[PDB]
Every structure is written in structure tokens, then in C-alpha cells.
Design a protein around this ligand. Structure first.
Ligand SMILES: Cc1cc2nc3c(=O)[nH]c(=O)nc-3n(C[C@H](O)[C@H](O)[C@H](O)COP(=O)(O)O)c2cc1C
Ligand code: SF4
Ligand code: SF4
Ligand code: SF4
Ligand code: SF4
Ligand code: FES
Ligand code: FES
Ligand SMILES: [Mg+2]
Lengths: 217, 42, 230, 59, 431, 62
């Protein structure tokens, strides 16, 4: 389906090249650490990490932030815009405090991911691409997040909440809005990707160093 | 004793945890190779 | 020294590193192309130049594949014709019906290559894509629904004119070529993007609607606006 | 299907149908059609001259 | 002979499920970081020979001989740096093995990076991890810091005189940047559109230097292979498909999980043993996708007698892929599932080249009409032809991976499509 | 309309060779100016030059 977000920028009072933005000195130290992870003469390779750091600092990516990153890296602002528009993890528009991202691909769709999405929508009273009126939660659909064996799952600010049920996700939303921070991970009693019935492998203590080492070494 | 999930250190990380870790091991790196120019535009 | 390749079984002596398209041009065959320009870099994205090597099970992008020793290039093979028809089908499937109102009109590479290498019928039963037009100055008129994302204007802009204010924003079928901001592409070499744009997306604004290519009489003269003598 | 005197039509809104594409001028066997166009005040692709010579047309 | 029943004494990926310590002390309690100096002193040729004898094939999709790839990388230096690039953009819909390896065996991953870099003559190893895996990336950074402090990586790595660096690059969300050349492009701060071969990455990679892209599981099993033999690794598996493999069983199954087994375990045994079988029983099975979304689907008839192996699944008009087993039982809409996969491919297409761009959007629309029957039976062969036009005419393999599920659906469930179209025609006729 | 008085305004002839055209013009008695054919010079194209390690040919976009 259509994304619903345009890939052109029209100047607004809240988003314009004159919007005040700059990195904190700690973020400048982080940028200095990031830049020298790449060979000399290839400073352009830091565009993605620097843009991610700017988004983490500001909460989203304004055109002023993009221009500041371009000035810092001595790279064309159009290239910075290309990167920011290409990669979907960059917020080119302000979002809520908690960014719920429900994975709705086939491995998660086979389990009741639609139930999770409906429970989230009814708990907050917002649609699948809107933000709560108190600017607290934003809800979107996303593709596979790498936790297929723990379907259904959502991501809320780089934390995975897996093996969800409508009651569990409603509890997570209530805990988030109260002020607490829920523990990421499966909610069905599992600790990780192990089968729920019980450990069908790795049930014996691991072998020590040099268990089956070759005779040569 | 393999009944306790020992990967619990990740319920503490913050917004800048990854970048702070990257800063910490900056001193452990080695000098980067040089292309001979400041930028491809140079 | 020169290596020996074959084009439809005809022996050609080409320098190492020469592309399949250049070998075919040397033998006298102009491989159809949209994104390839000899003065620009090699992009290899439109996929219109795919040709078949005699024993290779896979077609190769003739504009980017260097030739090897003893390569027989099948320019007019069934696989090459099917590949060209498929690429043209995709291009015209998403292309809009603007030919009578489009200045490119009778001098369009998409039209000519469609008539020489593509099919004559449409299987596209869905709706088409519409793209918001941009504004990049009083010289170039942009109707971006007609763009085929061949990235000629971007490559020309950067490499030749030293101005990197053009590029692609977004990804997928929603990828758009432009500036992403209200910035005019003002430079002393900005009409060549009008010239090299294979479609009517980039057209001359002063020349808009005035004439059609078959009517114009061409007189070969020189330039006096500067001392270059173009 | 009878072919008689020529005419230029309009859309029901009153706007002229012709878009100055010169296909009729190109295909006219007798070269009896002359067309000159330019952008209109509202930017439409509309003709400023559309002449047909009825002593040259073969109908 | 029979395959499967892998023993915990032979499973390479210990500490899976995160039931043991993942730190340096925990890894050293297992066999990790043992005689790494001896391996490095054995050197590049010996490591490459050991890998070739083990016969390890590519663990991140298209299975190529890793020994052959690293031998390609083993050319003499010509004044340019050398890079091993470890792919951890696990965007494949069905895969969690790389995430588990990173989160629970980061020191195994780091030691594998070091061994691969020594075999390739590489100065640096860039582990490109997807941005969603923030906690996994942080754990990887912690393990890298521990290794640097212990001296296992850095100048004079493991006391062998070989200087080697390990960096972690957090990408953004791009299943296309998952691809090797697109990953290389993304590292350089560009959009992340795949390159054209030639030049191959072994000749011109990231920054233009010789760089070789390897999967997380491949590099993670490399050092265990080096410490052990490789006759043993070749013994585990079929003749031309050797080793152990991580399978992610998910979907309509009782106990979805990630497990490690032999490289030729039959699919039915794997499902019935490590996942509790299909929810409604094996008689309720409808289809299985054995290698993630890219690989086509196989019905219950093929799944009854098939081995989870590269060649075995290739003979089944499918592929092993990334060993992601998605199970769909009889109570599912297979057409809607394949439509969702095609929509995923449409969303994740980089859009560089016309066949995949336009054709994948077109197939998304066609399948969206198919799932409600709003079509005609003549359009199924048209969709097949469109998929064939897409396949093999694209820059990267995402175009091929976006047409194989369509081809599998058309090949195994054409009667369902025709029945749904007839139902829609009947419903429209009534009104 | 655009009138004219030159009979040879629309007269364009096609010749396979410069020598043939020159001979025709000479035997018909008109003056003639000959311009040599301009063929593009062969150019070295390389896709891998877009990713050069130390040269300016590296492209900033694709
Ligand atoms: C996590 C991951 C994601 C991948 N995603 C893609 C993809 O989207 N498209 C593709 O054509 N190949 C993809 N590949 C395969 C790569 O082209 C390449 O084969 C792999 O990164 C290295 O091969 P290996 O298995 O020998 O290590 C992916 C590989 C990995 C490890
Ligand atoms: S660019 Fe070519 S195909 Fe497109 S509307 Fe213009 S003349 Fe027609
Ligand atoms: S605007 Fe024209 S030159 Fe530029 S990418 Fe589109 S078709 Fe090519
Ligand atoms: S120029 Fe002629 S053919 Fe074209 S729209 Fe006008 S009347 Fe019709
Ligand atoms: S096949 Fe698709 S994803 Fe791959 S290069 Fe082409 S447009 Fe990009
Ligand atoms: S399909 Fe949802 S995490 Fe993979
Ligand atoms: S001309 Fe070769 S792919 Fe475009
Ligand atoms: Mg043009």
C-alpha cells in the first residue's frame, strides 16, 4: 500500500532551514569517535551513523538537522537528503514519545498479529498511522523485524516485546504511559527463542576448552 | 545450571549506549589507511 | 594487445576492458539504451541493453559488462528480444499517455525504441503512477510523471556541471528524481539535461508547445555568444 | 460517416479539444493544414493559428 | 544413511537460547578463544585449506563455497587495505539465527571475524548489523570491548603479530541493504543500491578496497572448524552439503523456535521433533516455505519426503536459502500470505532498476486483486510471464526473490486461484 | 503563410559516398562545399571506476 508520507520537502514554520539545531558537545565527541572508524578521505561513510545520532538527540530529523550533518561531514546536502529519504528508520516528521511498530509480515501474520494491531488501536483510539492527541504514542506497521520465531511482536524505541497477546500489549501500553519501563522480551513464559514445550537441545553442560581439537594444532 | 536467562544485561541500555561503547574502544583502534586526498571531491 | 570477440559470429578485434555495447557499436550495431551515455558514467539500471552471450545462460548488461576472449554476442537472439520487450513493457506500463501534449513528441527515445524493440500491445490492467512536478528554474520545465528514473540528469549534473543538487529521494516505485527542496538548478550548462533526458520529463520551457520535430529544418552553423565557437 | 465541411469541436465545458499536437498536419496528404501554437495565459497547450485550405484539401 | 539427531557435544552454537553467560569468561569456558594464536601462526593457506576440506557453503542465502570465496580474496596485496564484511542485516522474513548468534555468541562471532580476516589477509572487519537489533549490537560492542581489553583483537592479535581491527556499523531499515553489494554501498554512506558485477567485491569492495562479504553464521562457524578438523564437519552432512545448520521453525506450529541440526535432516522429522509438529497435526499441514520468503513454497506432498538441504530442496523446485521454515496449516489463506510477501518485496525494493521496480509493483497489484478473486483466469499465465520477465533481468537477486514465491503459488495452487475467481464472478453476477 | 521563390529549397539528395556526391555536384555544375564526416572517438568506459579507492572518478550517488 501507499506509504502516506511524501518524499518532497515544503518549508513550514516548524520545519525550515532556519530551525535551530546543533549537536551537544557529548554528541560532537561521539561524532569524532565515529568519523575515525573509516579510512582517511572517506568521511562520507559516516552519514548514516551521524544522522542516526542527530535523530536520537532531536527526536526526529528536520531539514536543518540534515543541513547541519551535511556541513559537519562536508558532503552534499542532496546526498544527505537521499540517505534520509531512502532509509525508513529516519523520522523526517515528528513522532510521539513511544514509536510502536507492529510487524505485519507473513511469519507474524500467521499468528494473530492483526489481533495485536487491533488491540493497540482500540487501547489508544488512533489509526494505524496516526499519533495520540497527547503526543505520547505513535503507531505504525513495519516489515519483518528479525523475531519471527517469537511472533507476534512489536518494537517500541529499540526494545522488542515478543510473543504478544492483546492483554499483554495492553498492559505494556498502560505501563509505558504510566511512566515505568516494561522489560523487553517474550511475554508467554519463554526467555528466548527456545521451544515453549522445553529444551529439545543443549540440555547437557557445554564441553570445556579443546574438547575435540585437531591433532595439528 | 541452565535454567536462568543470563542475557539480562540488555535491560539497562540507554539512547547513547552504542555510541558510548564506540567512544570507549576508540583508544583500542589502529591508525586508519589514507586515500591520499581529503575527499573524493578534492 | 587486442583480444578477439565475436558479434553474431563476425570477428572483431577490441581492446581489453571494452564493453559489449562498444564491441557491437564497433561492428556496426547500436544496442538500445536509455540510461547509457558515452559522455557520462556507467549506470546500468534501465536494463534495456541486455544481450545474450552464446553459451552464457544469463543475459548481460551490454553497457557495463567488459568483453572476454572468445565471446560471441547474440544481438538479435530470441532471449535478447524477449528481454528488450519485457523492459519496454515495464517502462510503458508505468509511463503516462501524454504523447500528443508532450514536447518530446516525435523525437522520443521511448517512442522510437518502443516501435523498434518493444511489443505493440499493453497487458497493464491496473492504474498508473502520478508524480508531483518540481520547479528547478525558468529554463527547464519538469513533468516528472514521464520520468523513467534513468539518472542521466543526476549523473550529468554532478560529473559535468560540478553541481550535486539533483538526486533520487525515497525507494521503490515511489522513487522520485529532483532536489527534495524548492531549489532551482541554475547553472551555465543546464540545457544539456533537457537534451539528454530520453523522455519528455525535462523539456525546454521557451520552446514549449511551439513546434514538432518533423517540421523543423536543421541548419548547421556555429555559435557567436562567446569565443569557444561551439 | 459522411465527410463534409470541417469543424473544430469543444468539450462540454466549452474548452477547445485541440491540443496542438500537429498529428493532423503531419498526416494530411495534401498539406492543407497549418498549425502554430504557444502556451496560453493559463499554460494550456493551445493553437494560435489553425488554418485549413479547402481548395487544397482532398476531403 | 540417515541424517539428523545432532548431539549437544557436536553442536557448534552452544549458549543458544541464552541459558549461559555470553561474556568473555563464558565463551572461554566453552572452546572459544582456544589456540587462536596457533591458528593464526598456521596462517592463511592452512585456514583456507581447512575451510575447503570442511566444505562450508554460504549460510546467508545463496550457498557458495566459502573456501573458494576466501581463496578469491587470497590474492597478493597491491597497496590497498583489506576488509572482511560480516552481514547481519537479517531482513529475511523468517530468519532469527543471525540475531541469536550475535546476542548469545558475540565472542564466537568476533573470533570468527579474526580467523576470517587472517585467512583473507584483511586488516579490518566491518560487521554491518541492522538498526533494529540495537540490543544485539550493544552486546556485540561489549564483547568487542572485552576482546580488545584481553588483547584478542587489536595490534598483535592474540599474541601472533597480526594486526586486525573489528568495527560495528549500525545500518537503518533496508532489506535491500541486506544484500552484499547494497550493504557495501550503505557502509560508504550512500543510498544502498546494489552494484553490478564486475567488478566483484573480491576485486573492488567497500571503499574500493578488496573486501569479502560473509554471513554471520559462516564466520561464526569458521573458528570452530579451525579449532576442530573439517573432516568432522564434512562428516556431518551429505556428500556435497556438509556441516550443521540453524533452522528457524515458525508459523502455524506448536512450538516455534530456532534450533541447530544436521544439514540434511528431513523436514517432517524436524517439525515433529524440535517444534511439536503442526498445530492441527501433520494431516493439517498445507504448505511450507523452507528458506524464507525468497524460496518458493512446497505443499504437504513434497514436505512428506524431503531433506532440508541445498541440493535436496533444489530438486524440489525450491531452495534451502537461509533455512527459515515457515509452516502454513490448512486453515490459512495461502494466496493472502503470498500477497503479503509480495507487498513486503514491493516495500523493500530499492527501486534502482526497472524490471524489479515496475514489475514488483505490478505483481503486488495483481496479487492484491487475486486474493479477492477480482480477476480472470487468463491473468494467471500473464502473471507468470511477468515474473519470468522480472527474474534474471535485474541488477541484484531481490528481483529473482520477488518472483519465486509468485511462481510457487501459481505452480502449486492454481486451482485455488481459479476457484476464488469463479466465486467472485458468481458473487458479482448475483448482484 | 510563408511564401518562397526558390525552386531548390526542399531539394535534398542522398549519396552513399563523398566521392559520389562530389562527382554528382561537379557534373551538374553547382558549386559545392564538402564537410568531412565526424565520427565519435572511441572512449574507455569502466563501471568499476565509480568506486575508485584513490581517484576522483568515484561517484557520490547512484
Ligand atoms: C542477513 C543477510 C541478508 C541478506 N539479504 C539479501 C537480500 O535482501 N537480497 C539478496 O539478493 N541477497 C541477500 N543476502 C545474500 C547476500 O547476497 C550474500 O550472499 C551474503 O551476504 C554473503 O554470502 P554467504 O552466505 O556466503 O556469507 C543476504 C545475506 C545475509 C547474511
Ligand atoms: S516522453 Fe515519449 S513516450 Fe512519454 S509522453 Fe512524451 S513522447 Fe510519449
Ligand atoms: S528526468 Fe529524464 S534524465 Fe533525469 S532520470 Fe528521469 S528520464 Fe532520466
Ligand atoms: S493538432 Fe490536429 S490532430 Fe492534434 S489535437 Fe489538434 S486537431 Fe487534433
Ligand atoms: S532488483 Fe530491485 S532491489 Fe535489486 S537493484 Fe534492481 S530495483 Fe534495486
Ligand atoms: S516476520 Fe515479523 S519478525 Fe519476521
Ligand atoms: S543501457 Fe545498459 S542497463 Fe541501461
Ligand atoms: Mg528531453
Amino acid at each position: 500500500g501507499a506509504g502516506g508520507a511524501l518524499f518532497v520537502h515544503r518549508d513550514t514554520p516548524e520545519n525550515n532551514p532556519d530551525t535551530p539545531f546543533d549537536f551537544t558537545p557529548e554528541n560532537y565527541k561521539r561524532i569524532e569517535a565515529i568519523v575515525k572508524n573509516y579510512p582517511e578521505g572517506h568521511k562520507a561513510a559516516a552519514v548514516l551513523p551521524v544522522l542516526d545520532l542527530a535523530q536520537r538527540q532531536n527526536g526526529w530529523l528536520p531539514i536543518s538537522a540534515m543541513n547541519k550533518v551535511a556541513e559537519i561531514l562536508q558532503v552534499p546536502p542532496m546526498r544527505v537528503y537521499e540517505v534520509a529519504t531512502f532509509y525508513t528508520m529516519y523520522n523526517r516528521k515528528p513522532v510521539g514519545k513511544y514509536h510502536i511498530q507492529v510487524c505485519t509480515t507473513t511469519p507474524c501474520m500467521l499468528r494473530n498479529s492483526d489481533s495485536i494491531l487491533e488491540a493497540i488501536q482500540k487501547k489508544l483510539g488512533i489509526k494505524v498511522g496516526e499519533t495520540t492527541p497527547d503526543k505520547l504514542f505513535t503507531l505504525i506497521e513495519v516489515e519483518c523485524l528479525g523475531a519471527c520465531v517469537n511472533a507476534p511482536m512489536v518494537q517500541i524505541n529499540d526494545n522488542y516485546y515478543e510473543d504478544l497477546t492483546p492483554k499483554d500489549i495492553e498492559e505494556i501500553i498502560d505501563e509505558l504511559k504510566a511512566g515505568k519501563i516494561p522489560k523487553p522480551g517474550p511475554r508467554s513464559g519463554r526467555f528466548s527463542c527456545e521451544p515453549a514445550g522445553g529444551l529439545t537441545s543443549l540440555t547437557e553442560p557445554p564441553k570445556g576448552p579443546g574438547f575435540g581439537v585437531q591433532a595439528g594444532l | 545450571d541452565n535454567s536462568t536467562y543470563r542475557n539480562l544485561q540488555h535491560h539497562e541500555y540507554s539512547t547513547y549506549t552504542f555510541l558510548d561503547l564506540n567512544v570507549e574502544l576508540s583508544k583500542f583502534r589502529m591508525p586508519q589507511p589514507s586515500s591520499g586526498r581529503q575527499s573524493p571531491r578534492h | 594487445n587486442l583480444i578477439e570477440v565475436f558479434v553474431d559470429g563476425q570477428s572483431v578485434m577490441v581492446e581489453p576492458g571494452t564493453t559489449v555495447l562498444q564491441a557491437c557499436e564497433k561492428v556496426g550495431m547500436q544496442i538500445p539504451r536509455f540510461c547509457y551515455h558515452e559522455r557520462l558514467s556507467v549506470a546500468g539500471n534501465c536494463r534495456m541493453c541486455l544481450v545474450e552471450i552464446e553459451k552464457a545462460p544469463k543475459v548481460v548488461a551490454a553497457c557495463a559488462m567488459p568483453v572476454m576472449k572468445g565471446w560471441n554476442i547474440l544481438t538479435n537472439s530470441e532471449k535478447s528480444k524477449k528481454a528488450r520487450e519485457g523492459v519496454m513493457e515495464f517502462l510503458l506500463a508505468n509511463h503516462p499517455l501524454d504523447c500528443p501534449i508532450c514536447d518530446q513528441g516525435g523525437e522520443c527515445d521511448l517512442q522510437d525504441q518502443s516501435m523498434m524493440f518493444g511489443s505493440d500491445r499493453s497487458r497493464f490492467l491496473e492504474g498508473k503512477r502520478a508524480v508531483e512536478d518540481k520547479n528547478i528554474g525558468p529554463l527547464v520545465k519538469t513533468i516528472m510523471t514521464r520520468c523513467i528514473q534513468c539518472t542521466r540528469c543526476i549523473r550529468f549534473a554532478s560529473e559535468i556541471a560540478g553541481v550535486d543538487d539533483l538526486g533520487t529521494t525515497g525507494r521503490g516505485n515511489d522513487m522520485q528524481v529532483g532536489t527534495y527542496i524548492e531549489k532551482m538548478f541554475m547553472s551555465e550548462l543546464s540545457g544539456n539535461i533537457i537534451d539528454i533526458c530520453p523522455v519528455g520529463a525535462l523539456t525546454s520551457k521557451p520552446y514549449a508547445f511551439t513546434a514538432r520535430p518533423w517540421e523543423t529544418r536543421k541548419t548547421e552553423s556555429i555559435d557567436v555568444m562567446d569565443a569557444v565557437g561551439s | 460517416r459522411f465527410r463534409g465541411e470541417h469543424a473544430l469541436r469543444r468539450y462540454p465545458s466549452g474548452e477547445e479539444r485541440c491540443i496542438a499536437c500537429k498529428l493532423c498536419e503531419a498526416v494530411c496528404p495534401a498539406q492543407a493544414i497549418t498549425i502554430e501554437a504557444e502556451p496560453r495565459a493559463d499554460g494550456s497547450r493551445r493553437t494560435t493559428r489553425y488554418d485549413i485550405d479547402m481548395t487544397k484539401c482532398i476531403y | 544413511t540417515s541424517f539428523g539427531s545432532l548431539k549437544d557435544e557436536d553442536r557448534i552454537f552452544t549458549n543458544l537460547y541464552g541459558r549461559h553467560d555470553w561474556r568473555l569468561k563464558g565463551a572461554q569456558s566453552r572452546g572459544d578463544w582456544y589456540k587462536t594464536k596457533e591458528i593464526l601462526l598456521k596462517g592463511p593457506d592452512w585456514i583456507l585449506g581447512e575451510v575447503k576440506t570442511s566444505g562450508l557453503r554460504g549460510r546467508g542465502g545463496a550457498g557458495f563455497p566459502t573456501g573458494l570465496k576466501w581463496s578469491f580474496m587470497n590474492k597478493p596485496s597491491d597497496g590497498r587495505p583489506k576488509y572482511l564484511v560480516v552481514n547481519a542485516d537479517e531482513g529475511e522474513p523468517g530468519t532469527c539465527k543471525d540475531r541469536e548468534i550475535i546476542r548469545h555468541d558475540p565472542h564466537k562471532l568476533v573470533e570468527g571475524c579474526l580467523v576470517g580476516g587472517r585467512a583473507m589477509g584483511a586488516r579490518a572487519a566491518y560487521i554491518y548489523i541492522r538498526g533494529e537489533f540495537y540490543n544485539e549490537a550493544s552486546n556485540l560492542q561489549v564483547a568487542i570491548r572485552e576482546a580488545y581489553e584481553a588483547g584478542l583483537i587489536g595490534k598483535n592479535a592474540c599474541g601472533s603479530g597480526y594486526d586486525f581491527d573489528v568495527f560495528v556499523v549500525r545500518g537503518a531499515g533496508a532489506y535491500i541493504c541486506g544484500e552484499e553489494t547494497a550493504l557495501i554501498e550503505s557502509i560508504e554512506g550512500k543510498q544502498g543500491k546494489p552494484r553490478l558485477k564486475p567488478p566483484f567485491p573480491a576485486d573492488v569492495g567497500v571503499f574500493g578496497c578488496p573486501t569479502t562479504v560473509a554471513n554471520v553464521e559462516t564466520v561464526a562457524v569458521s573458528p570452530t572448524i579451525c579449532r576442530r578438523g573439517g573432516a568432522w564437519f564434512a562428516s556431518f552432512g551429505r556428500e556435497r552439503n556438509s556441516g550443521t545448520k540453524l533452522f528457524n521453525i515458525s508459523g502455524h506450529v506448536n512450538h516455534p523456535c530456532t534450533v541447530e541440526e544436521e544439514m540434511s535432516v528431513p523436514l517432517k522429522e524436524l517439525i515433529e521433533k524440535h517444534a511439536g509438529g503442526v498445530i492441527g497435526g501433520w494431516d493439517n499441514l498445507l504448505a511450507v516455505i523452507p528458506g524464507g520468503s525468497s524460496t518458493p513454497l512446497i505443499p504437504k506432498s513434497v514436505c512428506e519426503t524431503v531433506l532440508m538441504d541445498f541440493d535436496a530442496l533444489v530438486q524440489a523446485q525450491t531452495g534451502l536459502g537461509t533455512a527459515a521454515v515457515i509452516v502454513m496449516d490448512r486453515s490459512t489463506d495461502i494466496v493472502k500470505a503470498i500477497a503479503r510477501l509480495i507487498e513486503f518485496y514491493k516495500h523493500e525494493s530499492c527501486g534502482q532498476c526497472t524490471p524489479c521496480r515496475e514489475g514488483v509493483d505490478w505483481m503486488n497489484k495483481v496479487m492484491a486483486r487475486f486474493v479477492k478473486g477480482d480477476a480472470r483466469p487468463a491473468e494467471i499465465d500473464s502473471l507468470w510471464e511477468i515474473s519470468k520477465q522480472i527474474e534474471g533481468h535485474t541488477i541484484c537477486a531481490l528481483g529473482d526473490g520477488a518472483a519465486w514465491p509468485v511462481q510457487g503459488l501459481i505452480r502449486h495452487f492454481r486451482p485455488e486461484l481459479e476457484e476464488r475467481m469463479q466465486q467472485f464472478a458468481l458473487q458479482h453476477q448475483a448482484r | 503563410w510563408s511564401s518562397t521563390a526558390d525552386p531548390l529549397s526542399n531539394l535534398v539528395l542522398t549519396f552513399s559516398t563523398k566521392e559520389d556526391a562530389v562527382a554528382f555536384a561537379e557534373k551538374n555544375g553547382w558549386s559545392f562545399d564538402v564537410e568531412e564526416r565526424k565520427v565519435p572517438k572511441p572512449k574507455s568506459k569502466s563501471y568499476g571506476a565509480n568506486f575508485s579507492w584513490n581517484k576522483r572518478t568515484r561517484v557520490s550517488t547512484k
